[PDB]
Amino acid sequence: XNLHFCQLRCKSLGLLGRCAXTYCACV
Amino acid sequence: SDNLWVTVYYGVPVWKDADTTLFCASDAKAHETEVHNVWATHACVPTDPNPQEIHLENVTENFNMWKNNMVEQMQEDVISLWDQSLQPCVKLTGGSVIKQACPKISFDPIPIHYCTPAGYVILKCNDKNFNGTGPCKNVSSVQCTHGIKPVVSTQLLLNGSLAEEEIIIRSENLTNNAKTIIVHLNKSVEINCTRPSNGGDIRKAYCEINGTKWNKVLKQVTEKLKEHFNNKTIIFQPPSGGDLEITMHSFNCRGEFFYCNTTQLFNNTCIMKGCNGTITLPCKIKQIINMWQGTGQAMYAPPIDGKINCVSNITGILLTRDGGANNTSNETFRPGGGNIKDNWRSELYKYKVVQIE
Amino acid sequence: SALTQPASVSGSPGQSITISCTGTSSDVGSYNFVSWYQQHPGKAPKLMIYEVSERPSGISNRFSGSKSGNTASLTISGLQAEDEADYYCSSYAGSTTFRVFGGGTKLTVRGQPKAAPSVTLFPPSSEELQANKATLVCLISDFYPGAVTVAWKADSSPVKAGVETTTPSKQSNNKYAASSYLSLTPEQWKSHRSYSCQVTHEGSTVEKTVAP
Amino acid sequence: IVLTQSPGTLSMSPGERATLSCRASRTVSSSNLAWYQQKPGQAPRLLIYDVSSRATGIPDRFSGRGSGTDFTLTISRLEPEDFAVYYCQQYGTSPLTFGGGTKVEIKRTVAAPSVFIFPPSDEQLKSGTASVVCLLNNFYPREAKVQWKVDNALQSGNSQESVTEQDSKDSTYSLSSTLTLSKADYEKHKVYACEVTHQGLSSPVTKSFNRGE
Amino acid sequence: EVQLVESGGGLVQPGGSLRLSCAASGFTFSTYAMSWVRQAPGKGLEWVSSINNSGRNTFSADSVKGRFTISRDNSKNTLFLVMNSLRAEDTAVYYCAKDLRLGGGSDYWGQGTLVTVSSASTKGPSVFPLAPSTAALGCLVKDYFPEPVTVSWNSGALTSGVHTFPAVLQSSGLYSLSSVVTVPSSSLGTQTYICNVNHKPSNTKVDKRVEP
Amino acid sequence: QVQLVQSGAEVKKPGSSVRVSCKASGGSFSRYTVNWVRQAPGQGLEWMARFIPIFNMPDYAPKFQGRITITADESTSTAYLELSSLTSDDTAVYYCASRQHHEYFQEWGQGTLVTVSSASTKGPSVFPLAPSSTAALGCLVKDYFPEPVTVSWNSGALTSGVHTFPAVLQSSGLYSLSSVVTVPSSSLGTQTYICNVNHKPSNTKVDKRVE
Ligand SMILES: *[C@@H]1O[C@H](CO)[C@@H](O)[C@H](O)[C@H]1NC(C)=O
Ligand SMILES: *[C@@H]1O[C@H](CO)[C@@H](O)[C@H](O)[C@H]1NC(C)=O
Ligand SMILES: *[C@@H]1O[C@H](CO)[C@@H](O)[C@H](O)[C@H]1NC(C)=O
Ligand SMILES: *[C@@H]1O[C@H](CO)[C@@H](O)[C@H](O)[C@H]1NC(C)=O
Ligand SMILES: *[C@@H]1O[C@H](CO)[C@@H](O)[C@H](O)[C@H]1NC(C)=O
Ligand SMILES: *[C@@H]1O[C@H](CO)[C@@H](O)[C@H](O)[C@H]1NC(C)=O
Ligand SMILES: *[C@@H]1O[C@H](CO)[C@@H](O)[C@H](O)[C@H]1NC(C)=O
Ligand SMILES: *[C@@H]1O[C@H](CO)[C@@H](O)[C@H](O)[C@H]1NC(C)=O
Ligand SMILES: *[C@@H]1O[C@H](CO)[C@@H](O)[C@H](O)[C@H]1NC(C)=O
Ligand SMILES: *[C@@H]1O[C@H](CO)[C@@H](O)[C@H](O)[C@H]1NC(C)=O
Ligand SMILES: *[C@@H]1O[C@H](CO)[C@@H](O)[C@H](O)[C@H]1NC(C)=O
Ligand SMILES: [Cl-]
């Protein structure tokens, strides 16, 4: 992957979000 | 009898690209309680003892690892493998908390081969520095793929094949940073992971890599990368954020779920204070994980007692580039992975289904 | 049946017999997945041996499998009355052939002696020739071993057509019966001096003849 | 793809290394090439395979190597049962092909032929055909010329010949030039000569006979 | 214990279609490779098709390819065989089998279900007397479908030496049985017999007579 | 073990078809194993046919493309070759040879002489080759078909000195060879010598050499 939840989680670390299959990668 | 009957063929016959349902084959033992064996005896046929290869002399066929339906099918099967064997106690998926039994298992991957049915044939690219896309000039046909262990992991590819000749870089589009980069190594380095039996934190584990043998391979990985990014200073960093499954080297060893920190593996100062000796990466066994299968969380039972140990050959590295620095005398790479289809591509890159008639 | 077993095998009570199963090198000679099955009349087949020489739980230790080259052998020691049945072998044969079975082997156990069949042949009924057809009823009863060759004659030359003969089933008597029906039009019926059923049974020949 | 062995004949006495080699037209691929020993009256025999691996059964003597286009069938130390024809075949590439072969003849000192001549048989002339046999016996080397003369008119297209497969003991040859013609023509002429060129002859030897006798 | 119950067999015509079902119980259905093996009446065993545990991969014989397709519903512990474009040679008992491995031997079989591919119609028999020439008489039941037929002699009273034989399927999809009772050659014309035949499959009845 | 044994020698008219068989024993078979090679009389080896796996078709040598048919019965463990529209120079010894892991042939059959010819089977006419001026003598064995012929001397007594020459195929289509033997100048009456020729079918001719 849910990308919204990922983007949001990453924003908290000052980063954008991106799915890695089912996971959440921040860059 | 002895593995492999090689043959030559000329002109004939016509074939065109197509997709079809491939089956698997293994040397699974129907007496084994081990879970890949239990799965493979009833998922896969017994491997043929007389495999046949056929060099299709003077043909050039184009390949593309990044669109290969064989990969989507292996994923289908490796999932079925896990849903059968590694049943989590609690699985939080489909707006549902699914409680099913989670007994402790005997787990270690065996190879599975992928095979075409009647009317279809696998074409294999033997060009020894084949990146993964486009023309192949030493083509051959095979009944099945090589043995591929369905080793599910991130950052480091394990127990796979090596690149025969030179280190190979693989990407759907290398100038695109968002595209994952598979590194096929030509020489493997052992990573020796252990949860020791204390008799006490049962989740504290570690991996040991010969930091000598490694930091050589990495300097070569660097120099190969130098070629693709006009001689630029290739530079490693930790993963800039995300889930633990991809921020750490995550893999399954003896059934247990290992998470290991690869900060020490990508040290630029070694590419000579310390470095030479043994790199010891801190690991942590986890029960609650995110699932590679589908999106969701899952919990497995606490780890077994006694000494858990896996020694794996590192045969590839999944990296992502940073980008925006283009610009800059530098290109930054970070441990990646997460898409488990990329693992199956790391083996099925050289294969390609085709229809005969 | 790409595996060859002998059609029938016999043996005396208490003695050992060996049913053989011969295949190609791309099945029995490439794989240790030779299975053996038992089938009594009208019942499911039953695994006696699997993986060449393994014996499922609660199968008599008298049964035992073995392989040599492309040939697999089933062996029953201490042969008993009950073991009289059909037996099929089977092997894996690569991804396309997949699974081959033998023709099957009909195992009988000896004791009762040879005895030629009591043949009984009838001509067509006028009630049937009123309806403009003719069929001759050759009745074969009380023979052993249970295997007959039936050869029909028209006058002197043989006949191949209209012949409808049944695989011999076994009687309450523990011997075999059979049946052969030859269909002719009334035309051909009259057109010949005679017609003969001719039942060969272990060298022998019982021959009954009927005529107008 | 074509493959050829120079030379046709390789005359070398026992225990003498010196060797022959295969040679591909449009280069046979990967080390994928074998060779065979064929003796007179027998089937071919697998010697070496891939390029240097020696078949089960073969005791050494027979080395061999090559890679690109030049594969040497490697002699070193011959033997009495090692004088045979040696063939060669590439697996790798289009249609499987063999190579014309190289005969290893036994070498010896030069020996001129003992030329024997035979008039036709009186039994034969009853049938209307006359056959004049001229034997060349126990000579070396193989190459020899036999001219037929009828009243010293030179004959051509009526005289076939064949030769012994080199004798073991002596290591020599023999040859039968059989001059066939009609009894009509036989009785028409008188003196029948068998002129023999060779090597060990300063002057060409002629053997002759007149019609009976 | 493992249980496999096949269902959905029956009578069907050439080109017609059926679906078979196997109800699995007493084992984890979804982890075992399963197979269909058939047996034509009185012939050997033939592997028809197999399916792997997950159901993603199926295997079938050439003599059945592109008409039969094996499937499974692992949620419903069920095995299927869709049988399209049927032919006379597809006539067989079809067994459902739990395999030791995919392509290996089958360690439990169901009781099978019979599929009869026959372009044929219900019909009463043609009833004809088989006369005496110590002495034997009998009576012919010709061209009926389907099995069985019940037949007695003199209200079922006589049986001192009756022998109602086994039925014959003709190369024309029709069964044809005969009956035969023994007598001494001094009953002839004084005593009457009868041989009541009935074909409940129709209700067709004939209470005929056989005389010299 | 692994041994291959082929059908008997055969004689065929031009524009006809021959079928040789090759039965394998004590090894591993399949269609792929057998390759077919030939050799015309005293000429080189000539490869002809194989079976390509996977695809799995026959592949032939260009020379025989439309004339040839390769086959393998797996249960019988036999291979077959079928050459059609035969011509006088398809006469050869046809070998079956077992492919191994790489296409090199380790087992060869004993061979099969197919003699294509429109000549009729015939026994030889033997004639004296008489001495005059060691001393030589011999037996000319003319106009026979097909191959082979045996030639012995005094039933096997004489072996040292003999040179039974290879056959030569006359323009007629029949073969003809000579057997000679070298003997001491003075024994021509004291000692006798005779030649035993044996053609199948179906001749023995025991001839004598005086003078
Ligand atoms: C085969 O390769 C040769 C060069 O090695 C060349 O002459 C020819 O064009 C090629 N044929 C095909 C069909 O590519
Ligand atoms: C591995 O690959 C590199 C090319 O990137 C090469 O320089 C090195 O010699 C190779 N080493 C081995 C052991 O293959
Ligand atoms: C792979 O090689 C092709 C040219 O054959 C090229 O288009 C592609 O960029 C290469 N990929 C990489 C990652 O170098
Ligand atoms: C590769 O990536 C670059 C940068 O993201 C992009 O401009 C280009 O379209 C891509 N190339 C192809 C062939 O799609
Ligand atoms: C894995 O490690 C073992 C032991 O060093 C070695 O024999 C094997 O070849 C290795 N495989 C790879 C792919 O590196
Ligand atoms: C792996 O590490 C453990 C603990 O340090 C050690 O006992 C074992 O010998 C190592 N194995 C190898 C193959 O180096
Ligand atoms: C690490 O590898 C090097 C090179 O193979 C070897 O010489 C060294 O002994 C190894 N180090 C240890 C601590 O085993
Ligand atoms: C890995 O280790 C480094 C150094 O201890 C630490 O800064 C980093 O946060 C660790 N990574 C994760 C994902 O815990
Ligand atoms: C890199 O290596 C140096 C020298 O051994 C060491 O001081 C440093 O802690 C290492 N850093 C990382 C991030 O591994
Ligand atoms: C790699 O292979 C070894 C030996 O097959 C095995 O013990 C180990 O568990 C494998 N690695 C993983 C991550 O499964
Ligand atoms: C093709 O690759 C094979 C397998 O590595 C190799 O043995 C051979 O040298 C190559 N052949 C050709 C014709 O390119
Ligand atoms: Cl997070």
Two tokens, residue F96: 């079956």
E67 backbone dihedrals φ, ψ, rounded to 5°: -135, -45
Q: Is D142 left (phi over 0), alpha (psi -120 to 50) or beta?
A: alpha
Phi-psi region of B349 (alpha: psi -120 to 50; beta: other; left: phi over 0): alpha
CATH number for region D1-108: 2.60.40.10
- The phi and psi torsions of D10 (rounded to 5 degrees) equal -125, 100
Q: How far is the CA of B125 from the centre of ligand 11 (A)?
A: 10
Q: Which two tokens stand for residue C37?
A: 């099955």
Q: Is C60 exposed, middle or buried (0-12, 13-18, 19+ CB in 10 A)?
A: middle
D199 strand-pairing partners: none
- End-to-end CA, chain E: 60
Kindly identify which residue of chain F lies nearest to residue D88, measuring between CA atoms. Answer: F45
Instruction: Give, using CA atoms, the residue closest to atom 13 of ligand 5.
Output: B161
The maximal CA–CA distance of chain B, rounded, in angstroms, is 68
In angstroms, the CA D181 to CA E182 distance is 92
Q: Whose CA is nearest to atom 14 of ligand 2?
A: B186
Q: Is the fold of C1-111 the same as that of C112-212?
A: yes
Task: Determine how β-strand C8-11 pairs with β-strand C105-109.
Answer: parallel
Q: Using CA atoms, how far apart are residues F78 and C51, in angstroms rounded to an integer? A: 28
Say if D and F touch: at least 3 Cβ pairs within 8 Å.
Answer: yes
Q: Measured between alpha carbons, how far is D88 from B46 in angstroms, rounded to an integer?
A: 39
Tokens of E94: 């079809």
F156: which DSSP letter? Answer: G
Residues D202, D164: contact at Cβ < 8 Å? no
Neighbouring CB atoms inside 10 A of B206's CB total: 17
Identity of the amino acid at D109 = T
Which residues of B lie inside 8 Å of D (Cβ-Cβ)? 8, 10, 55, 57
The alpha-carbon radius of gyration of chain E (Å, integer) is 23
User: Cα–Cα distance between F127 and F205 in angstroms, integer?
Assistant: 10
Domain ranges of chain C: 1-111, 112-212
DSSP H or E stretch at residue A6: helix A3-11
Q: Are strands E113-117 and E10-12 parallel, antiparallel or unpaired?
A: parallel
DSSP string, D155-170: P-SSEEEEE----TTT
Using alpha carbons, list the distances in angstroms from residue B231 to B183, B227, D19: 18, 6, 52
For residue B172, give the ligand nearest its CA.
Answer: 3
Gap between the Cα atoms of D88 and B291, Å rounded: 61
Residue at B250 is within a domain: yes
Strand F149-153 vs strand F194-199: parallel, antiparallel, or unpaired?
antiparallel
Give the distance, in angstroms, between the CA of residue D73 and the centroid of all CA atoms in the same chain: 20
Q: Cα separation of E127 and E163, whole Å? A: 17
CA atoms within 13 A on the CB side of B285: 23
Count Cβ atoms below 10 Å from residue D186 Cβ, excluding itself: 20
Kindly report the number of other CB atoms within 10 A of residue A19's CB atom.
16
Q: Best mutation site among B152, B237, B243, B339 for testing chain A: the one with the most A CBs within 10 Å?
A: B243
Ligand 2 centroid distance, CA of B159 (Å): 19
Question: If 0-12 CB within 10 Å is exposed, 13-18 middle and 19+ buried, where does residue D36 land?
Answer: buried
Cα separation, E146 vs C163, whole angstroms: 21
Q: How far apart are CA D19 and CA D9, in angstroms?
A: 11
Residue A24: name the closest of B299, B248, B338, B284 by CA. B338
Q: Which residue has the tokens 């083996």?
A: B347
Nearest to B228 by CA among B131, B328, B350, B343: B131
CA dist E105 and E76 (Å) reads 24
Q: Which residues of C107-129 are buried (b: 16+ CB within 10 A; e: fewer)?
A: bbbeeeeeebbbbbbbbbbeebb
Q: Which two tokens stand for residue B34?
A: 């081990």
Q: Nearest CA to E12 among E125, E79, E111, E88?
A: E88
F13 Cβ neighbours under 8 A, 6+ residues apart = F86, F116, F117, F118
CA distance B252 to B303: 12
Class of domain C112-212: mainly beta
Distance of CA F21 to the CA centre of its chain: 16
Question: Which residue, among B185, B203, B215, B162, has the nearest Cα to B308 in the 3D structure?
Answer: B203
Fold of C1-111: Immunoglobulin-like (2.60.40)
Question: Cis link prior to D187 (omega < 30° from 0)?
Answer: no
Q: Cα E34 to chain center, whole Å?
A: 24
C-alpha–C-alpha distance, residues F94 and F49, integer Å: 11
What's the longest Cα–Cα distance across chain F? Answer: 73
Task: Write out the two tokens for E201.
Answer: 């499959």
Pick the closest to residue B240 from A13, A21, A19, A2 (CA basis). Answer: A13
Answer yes or no: same fold for D1-108 and D109-213. Answer: yes
Pocket of ligand 3 (CB under 6 A): B 131, 133-135, 169, 171, 174
Cβ-based neighbours of D154, under 8 Å, separated by 6 or more? D147, D148
Closest residue by Cα to residue F199 from F162, F151, F167: F151
In this structure, CATH architecture of domain D109-213: Sandwich (2.60)
Quick check: helix, strand or coil at residue F155? helix
Q: What is the DSSP letter of F122?
A: B
Contact (CB, 8 A) for F92 and F171: no
Burial of D39 (0-12, 13-18, 19+ CB in 10 A): middle
Name the closest-CA residue to atom 8, ligand 3: B133
> Could you tell me if B317 and B155 are in contact, meaning their C-beta atoms sit under 8 angstroms apart?
yes
Token pair, residue B192, equals: 């020796």
Distances (CA, A) of B107 to B36, B39, B82, B297: 7, 11, 11, 21
Show the CA angle centred on residue F31, arms to residues F29 and F32, nearest 5°: 90
- D93 in the Ramachandran plot: left (φ > 0), alpha (ψ -120 to 50) or beta? left
Q: In terms of Cα–Cα distance, which of B152, B219, B216 is closest to B189?
A: B216
A11, A13, A18, A20: CA torsion to nearest 10: -150
Looking at residue B138, the DSSP 8-state letter turns out to be S
Chains that touch E (3 or more CB pairs under 8 A): B, C
Phi and psi torsions of D188, nearest 5°: -70, -25
Distance CA C186, CA E96 (A): 49
Task: Provide the token pair at B269.
Answer: 């100062």
How far apart CA F79 and CA D128 sit, in angstroms, is 49
Alpha carbons within 13 angstroms on the beta-carbon side of residue E161 total 8
Which secondary structure element, helix H or strand E, spans residue A4, and what is its range? helix A3-11
Instruction: For residue B279, tell me if it sits in a domain.
Output: yes
Shortest-distance atom of ligand 9 to CA B238: 13
Q: Which of B182, B189, B184 is nearest to B167 (CA)?
A: B184
Q: Measured between CB atoms, does F142 come within 8 Å of chain D?
A: yes
Q: Does B45 touch chain C (CB under 8 A)?
A: yes
How far apart are the C-alpha atoms of D176 and F142, rounded to whole Å? 13
Closest alpha carbon to C196 in C144, C122, C125, C131: C122
Give a yes or no: residue B4 inside a domain: no
Asked if F211 and F138 count as a contact pair (C-beta separation under 8 A), the reply is no
Q: Coil, strand or helix: which one is E100?
A: coil
Q: Closest Cα to atom 6, ligand 8: which residue?
A: B263
Give the C-alpha separation, C168 to C176, whole Å. Answer: 6
Give alpha helix (H) positions in E9-141. none
Which H or E run includes B79?
Answer: helix B69-85
The conformational region for residue F173 under phi > 0 = left, psi -120 to 50 = alpha, else beta, is left
Measuring CA to CA, which residue among B188, B146, B141 is closest to residue B15? B141
Give the Cβ contact number of residue C148 at 10 Å. Answer: 24
SS3 D186: helix
Against chain C, the chains showing at least 3 CB pairs within 8 Å are: B, E, F
SS3 state at B83:
helix
User: Are the Cβ atoms of B6 and F53 closer than 8 angstroms?
Assistant: no
Ligand located closest to B186 CA: 2
Resolution in A: 2.9
Q: Which of B151, B161, B167, B188 maximizes ligand 5 atoms within 8 Å of its Cβ, making it the mutation to test the pocket?
A: B188
Rounded Cα gap, residues D20 and F126, in angstroms: 43
**Cα distance between residue F48 and residue F62, in whole Å:** 9
Helix axes B69-85, B35-43, angle to 10 degrees: 130
Looking at the DSSP bridge assignments, the partners of residue C109 are: C11
Structure tokens at C95: 């991804």
Task: Write the DSSP assignment of B170-232 as a string of letters.
Answer: E-S-TT-TTS-EEEEEEEEEEEEEEE------TTEEEEEEEHHHHHHHHHHHHHHHHHHTTT-
CA angle C203, C208, C211 (to 5 degrees): 150
Residue B163 contacts residue B75 (beta carbons within 8 Å):
no
Compare all CA atoms of chain F with the CA of C22 and give the residue at the minimum distance: F75
Helix segments in C21-167, DSSP class H = 94-97, 126-129
Domain that holds residue A22: 2-27
Handedness of CA B71, B72, B77, B79 (dihedral sign): positive
CA distance linking residue F18 with residue B13, whole number of Å: 28
Per-residue tokens: B111: 């190879």
**CA–CA dist C109, E52 (Å, integer):** 40
Tell whether the torsion through CA atoms of C180, C185, C188 and C192 is positive or negative: positive
Tell me which residue of B107, B48, B112 sits closest to B75, measured CA to CA: B112
Count of domains in chain B?
1
* Cα–Cα distance, B311 to B280 (Å, whole number): 14
What is d(CA F48, CA F63) in angstroms, rounded to the nearest whole number?
A: 8
Q: What are phi and psi for residue C165, nearest 5 degrees?
A: -110, 145
Number of other CB atoms surrounding residue D11 within 10 Å: 15
Give me the sign of the Cα torsion angle D158, D164, D166, D172.
negative
Cβ neighbours, 10 Å, residue B14: 8
Residues in contact with C50: Cβ distance below 8 Å, sequence separation at least 6, in sequence order: C33, C35, C36, C56, E100, E104, E105, E107
Answer whether F102's CB lies under 8 Å from D50's CB. yes
Structure tokens at D49: 């395979």
DSSP of C107-141: EEE--SPPB----EEE---HHHHTTT-EEEEEEEE
Contacts of C119 (CB under 8 A, 6+ apart): C138, C139, C140, C197, C199, C206, C207, C208
Number of domains chain A is built from: 1
Q: Which residue has the tokens 């669109």?
A: B67
Q: Is residue F144 a contact partner of residue F175, using CB atoms and an 8 Å limit? A: yes
In A, which residues are within 8 Å of B293 by CB distance?
Answer: 22
Angle at C120 between CA C119 and CA C125, to 5 degrees: 155
Phi and psi at residue F65, to the nearest 5°: -50, -55
The whole-angstrom distance between residue F203's C-alpha and the CA centroid of its chain comes to: 18
Q: Judge residue E135's burial from the number of C-beta atoms within 10 Å of its C-beta, 0-12 exposed, 13-18 middle, 19 or more buried.
A: middle
Side by side, the strands of the sheet bearing C134-143 are C120-122, C134-143, C176-184, C163-165
CA distance D14 to D171: 11
Which domains does chain E possess?
1-119 (no CATH), 120-212 (2.60.40.10)
Min distance B206 CA to chain A CA atoms (Å)? 23
Residue whose C-alpha is closest to residue E103's, from D208, C145, C97, D195: C97
How many beta carbons lie within 10 A of that of residue D42, not counting itself?
12
CA distance B302 to B255: 11
Helix, strand and coil content of chain B, in percent to the nearest 5, comes to: 15, 40, 45
CB within 8 Å of B80: residues ≥ 6 apart: B39, B43, E53, E54, E56
Can you tell me the distance from the alpha carbon of F48 to that of B32, in angstroms, rounded to the nearest whole number? 49
Are the C-beta atoms of E169 and E177 separated by less than 8 Å?
Answer: no
Q: What are the residues facing D173 on neighbouring strands?
A: D139
E191, with CB counted inside 10 A (0-12, 13-18, 19+), is exposed
Residues forming a β-bridge with E180:
E138
**Alpha-carbon distance F26 to F9, whole Å?**
24
Most B CBs within 10 A among E35, E52, E79, hence the mutation to make, goes to E52
CB contact under 8 A, F125 and D124: yes
CB spacing of C33 vs B23 below 8 angstroms:
no
SS3 category, B348: helix
Token reading at C118: 């009591």
CA–CA distances in Å: residue B168 to residues B184, B222, B330, B336, C117 = 5, 11, 20, 17, 82
Distance (Å, whole) CA B322 – CA B333: 6
Write down the domain spans for chain D. Answer: 1-108, 109-213
